């Protein structure tokens, strides 16, 4: 398998948007913010255990951080990974 302490650190947050809420209504897909070095096999095994649902497939993408100018310092936000987790059609959440 995997380690359960590895599982307890992969999933970070649920992502909130109009695309994230449309994907749950019509496509049966939750959108999550996951760890940056997480794999698709680690995300699938974490959702099936910590949420106790059945996952069909995981699609991931890396979001690039934006360059913001706070005052006069030119800064940059960090990158993060986003996962599209498709549940099976007998689902929950």
């Amino acid at each position: 398998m995997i380690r359960e302490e590895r599982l307890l650190k992969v999933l970070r947050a649920p992502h909130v948007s109009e695309k994230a809420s449309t994907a749950m209504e019509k496509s049966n897909t939750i959108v999550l913010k996951v760890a940056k070095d997480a794999t698709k096999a680690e995300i699938k095994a974490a959702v099936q255990k910590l949420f106790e649902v059945e996952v069909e497939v995981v699609n991931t993408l890396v979001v690039k951080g934006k360059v913001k100018r706070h005052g006069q310092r030119i800064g940059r936000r960090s990158d993060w990974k986003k996962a599209y987790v498709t549940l099976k059609e007998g689902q929950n959440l």
Binding site: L8, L11, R12, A13
Partner: protein
């Protein structure tokens, strides 16, 4: 703490380490959904994992 956890052995410390990481995952989901009012709980659980992993190493490598 740190004296109540010195009077447990390695498997009871492994049991408590997993319980602290389960609570740390549940505080993350409440804080990221705008549902956690007591934000001081995030620092407490984080530094108790550091206490348990400190004691596990000074029982094994010592």
């Amino acid at each position: 703490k740190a004296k109540e956890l010195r009077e447990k052995s390695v498997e009871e410390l492994n049991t408590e380490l997993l319980n602290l990481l389960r609570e740390q995952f549940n505080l993350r989901m409440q804080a990221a959904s705008g549902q956690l009012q007591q934000s001081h709980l995030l620092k407490q659980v984080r530094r108790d994992v550091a206490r348990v992993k400190t004691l596990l190493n000074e029982k094994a490598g010592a």
